[PDB]
Design an enzyme around this catalytic site. Structure first.
Site, PDB file in Angstrom:
ATOM      1  N   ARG A   1      80.657  22.629 -14.599  1.00 59.49           N
ATOM      2  CA  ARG A   1      81.225  22.298 -13.302  1.00 59.49           C
ATOM      3  C   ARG A   1      82.699  22.535 -13.116  1.00 59.49           C
ATOM      4  O   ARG A   1      83.166  23.083 -12.088  1.00 59.49           O
ATOM      5  CB  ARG A   1      80.815  20.879 -12.932  1.00 59.49           C
ATOM      6  CG  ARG A   1      81.156  19.715 -13.801  1.00 59.49           C
ATOM      7  CD  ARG A   1      80.811  18.374 -13.086  1.00 59.49           C
ATOM      8  NE  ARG A   1      81.767  18.102 -11.954  1.00 59.49           N
ATOM      9  CZ  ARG A   1      81.379  17.112 -11.116  1.00 59.49           C
ATOM     10  NH1 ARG A   1      80.239  16.377 -11.246  1.00 59.49           N
ATOM     11  NH2 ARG A   1      82.122  16.773 -10.081  1.00 59.49           N
TER      12      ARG A   1
ATOM     13  N   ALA B   1      82.179  -2.760  -8.371  1.00 64.45           N
ATOM     14  CA  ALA B   1      83.085  -3.564  -9.160  1.00 64.45           C
ATOM     15  C   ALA B   1      83.478  -4.803  -8.428  1.00 64.45           C
ATOM     16  O   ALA B   1      83.450  -5.904  -9.010  1.00 64.45           O
ATOM     17  CB  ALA B   1      84.418  -2.828  -9.516  1.00 64.45           C
TER      18      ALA B   1
ATOM     19  N   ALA C   1      95.084  -4.147   2.759  1.00 64.64           N
ATOM     20  CA  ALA C   1      96.074  -4.890   1.972  1.00 64.64           C
ATOM     21  C   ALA C   1      97.331  -4.012   2.133  1.00 64.64           C
ATOM     22  O   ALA C   1      97.220  -2.790   2.227  1.00 64.64           O
ATOM     23  CB  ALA C   1      95.800  -5.140   0.483  1.00 64.64           C
TER      24      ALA C   1
END
Lengths: 478, 478
Positions: A238, A18, A110
């Site tokens: 799962r 991204a 950050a």
């Protein structure tokens, strides 16, 4: 108010698909800074779109936002072709390092976003950069930007076992909440059922295909537990495999469970699973004659910071794309291939929106930098970090109940009160930033789970085994 | 009010040297019941007394009660000869099983003492028996007695690592506090510096003599850490070795440290330490070529329930002998051979006192037996048990500080509030009795430590490195 050490047009916090696909889309016309936590290097036919949207709505168990599903499914083929056009027929790292307009600040964490009405600036509330811990210089620097994109991943590190820790600390979700953003659906955390349990596992994962090829799931005595949970045994879905393991682990006080394909042929193993075979051999485990120790591991955050079609959050100038956000594409679970399309599709639309809004200004207030030194208290910060991770595993884990959730809340509140009382203005360190953010995100994760009075998708609670008739996302507001 | 399932003259809770040497001294004239947690089977010259008293006062670091030291030193030779006269030139088990007047109830866990003014009986406040969980029948039974002796050991199981868990659950200290007894000196807990750290260690211990024979103490990198703590290196006093290990373990986030005599000859090892050599071999460790993993382990409780020269507590009919008590013999530390003399000397005097006071009566109220069944909450009881043991290790462990102690207190208070809110009248189980008693004893252990503003003996706190000018025991009152 000082000159900021760094300044750019677009600050991107995170460096997976991204954040780098965004950085590359903007780089020919803008000055981009990519914040990297460690070293940065370590749909053709119509019927098909329609199916994709339907399978997503199904695996979302009834609460997907269908406009967000359709938005992603209809922008998927071109966001993928964009991948092919970049020569990335995997990673985007060499392409972004090759671009003169992208700068990468490596070993950066950050700390907090700088929001105008907080720096006594005037105008609409908006983000204008971030204070950033540079682990090379060991100082907190100012970074001024016209738009800041959160692209940091999920929050799976709040949990003791996690599959991808470097993209899971939750810093983006916590920073965005402190800046005023809403979050949603944080009770919908996916766990992989069979990660290697070992001191040098390096988060290795045991594939579903070992099971599709006959491996059995064993208790420490050596007996098969799945027929007690489900008739599909080792091939149950799962989430059901994870729940049985969680159950057994807790029911027996056991550290792990086991995955064994021994009972069957060897070269049979050798041909089908070399890469696993060798890896396990190199840890002194033979996939040919012995059980492999395994635990479930928190893997993906379906919730996160709320965003619209352009990846905009509630706070002007701030975007949030990929796993770090809640778009409403996933609903209560995660279908395979949608995490990567969400990354690509919202990196595309946030890019277009940032480009059409790009007004400059300013210089900014530095960080406080209280430099308090107490080596013994520093060792508690780490104790606190493990304690949070263990109790979340027990109290907001794979199987839930209302009294376990109240136990998590009570512990998260205690840690928040300790943090305030004992760490005020300690000097920043990674351990301290991670604790502060893991505890902030854990509070949001338990408040969302205590809110939903039903089992849907990834939220499974023994006190409310059924679905409600009317449902939707869990939304919290700071 | 029912007929009690068992009834005797003297109820003895515990079965080590103290409780069996007492049982055997009383058995020819009284009917004794010995409560066993699992299977019951698994000074000649004057100058010398004088030295013993002096060395005890020294290792007590200034707060021994010298009348209690002298009482034990002057009754030691005959309590030892009493051992020789029993043919026990080790254990007393076969002798007590051989006596027709001693009955042993195996797999029993005392729940609470029955105190007269509580069963709305009249007369002086006094103990008249105990409610006892029989793990064979799975029921709580009543046991009526004219005197009840606590002989259960110490409280080292409040800590994550413990050398002798079966004699360390703290049940006697907790029961005696709930019945109204004072406790004292519970901040003075001895830790052995080098226990085997291994999944099948079975609490094996690495002897000081490995060190007296040249073994080195290593960090996980393989370097020697003791020269950073003390010039005597590996031969520094035991408490100093434990403190350095605790320090390093916490400073590095390491699980253990290491003990290695490799650097030196083999048959050299073979001759000197076979019994260790073989044992470690059988766990896949060669004392000949590799480091042995080790952690400190809580070993002895110098404090406990307050008692006078006869082993009487503050509550008529109740005695407390051995490690479970505070006599004032030890002060702030423990000199070798005094734990065994305290056991023998107070088993002798409590025997004489019980014998000269022996008035019969009664029948008693059964236990409630709330039979609440919640299998998932039962799994939390165990989570709670580990959590207590880990946080005590960090927050009232080998090295202390005032802010770690406040963190322990805050956690012990939270557990007490959970216990009350969620377990009221659950059905008794060993895990539930152990939690309730470990949490009660942990509260007493932290309140004593928060009280002492100095480092003396086994209490070492970074905020108060010096001795006070005026000191004495730490005393709490219910």
């Amino acid at each position: 108010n000082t000159l900021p050490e760094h300044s750019c047009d677009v600050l991107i916090i995170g460096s997976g698909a991204a954040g780098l696909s965004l950085a590359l889309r903007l780089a020919d016309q803008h000055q981009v800074i990519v914040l990297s936590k460690g070293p940065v290097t370590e749909f053709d036919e119509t019927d098909s779109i329609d199916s994709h949207v339907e399978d997503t709505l199904i695996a979302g168990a009834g609460i997907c936002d269908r406009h967000a599903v359709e938005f992603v499914a209809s922008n998927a083929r071109s966001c993928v072709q964009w991948l092919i056009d970049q020569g990335v027929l995997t990673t985007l790292v060499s392409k972004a390092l090759n671009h003169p307009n992208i700068r990468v600040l490596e070993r950066t964490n950050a700390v907090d976003l700088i929001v105008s009405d907080k720096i006594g600036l005037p105008g609409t509330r908006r983000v204008v950069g971030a204070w950033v811990w540079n682990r090379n210089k060991e100082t907190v620097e100012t970074c001024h930007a016209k738009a800041v994109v959160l692209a940091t991943g999920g929050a799976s590190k709040v949990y003791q076992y996690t599959t991808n820790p470097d993209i899971s600390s939750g810093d983006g979700i916590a920073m965005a909440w402190r800046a005023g953003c809403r979050v949603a659906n944080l009770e919908f955390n996916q766990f992989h059922p069979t990660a290697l349990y070992h001191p040098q596992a390096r988060n290795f994962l045991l594939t579903e295909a070992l099971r599709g090829e006959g491996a059995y799931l064993k208790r420490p005595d050596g007996t098969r537990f799945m027929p007690d949970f489900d008739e599909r045994g080792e091939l149950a879905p799962r989430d059901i495999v994870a729940r049985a393991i969680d159950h057994e682990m807790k029911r027996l006080g056991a550290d792990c469970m086991f995955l064994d394909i021994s009972h069957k042929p060897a070269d049979f193993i050798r041909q089908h699973f070399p890469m696993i075979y060798e890896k396990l051999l190199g840890l002194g485990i033979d996939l040919t004659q012995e059980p492999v120790p395994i635990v479930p591991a928190a893997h993906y955050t379906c919730g996160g910071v709320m965003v619209d079609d352009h990846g905009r959050t509630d706070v002007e100038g701030l975007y949030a794309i990929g796993e770090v956000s809640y778009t409403g594409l996933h609903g209560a679970n995660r279908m395979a291939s949608n995490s990567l399309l969400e990354c690509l599709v919202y990196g595309w639309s946030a890019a277009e929106d940032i480009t059409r809004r790009m007004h400059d200004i300013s210089t900014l207030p530095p960080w406080d930098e209280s430099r308090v030194e107490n080596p013994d208290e520093r060792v508690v910060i780490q104790h606190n970090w493990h304690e949070l991770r263990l109790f979340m595993w027990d109290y907001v884990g794979i199987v839930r109940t209302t009294k376990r959730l109240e136990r998590a809340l009570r512990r998260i509140t205690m840690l928040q009160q300790e943090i305030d009382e004992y760490y005020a203005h300690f000097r920043v360190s990674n351990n301290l930033l991670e604790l502060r953010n893991l505890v902030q995100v854990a509070e949001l994760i338990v408040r969302c789970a205590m809110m939903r009075k039903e089992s849907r998708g990834l939220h499974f609670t023994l006190d409310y085994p059924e679905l409600l008739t009317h449902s939707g996302p869990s939304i919290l507001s700071p």
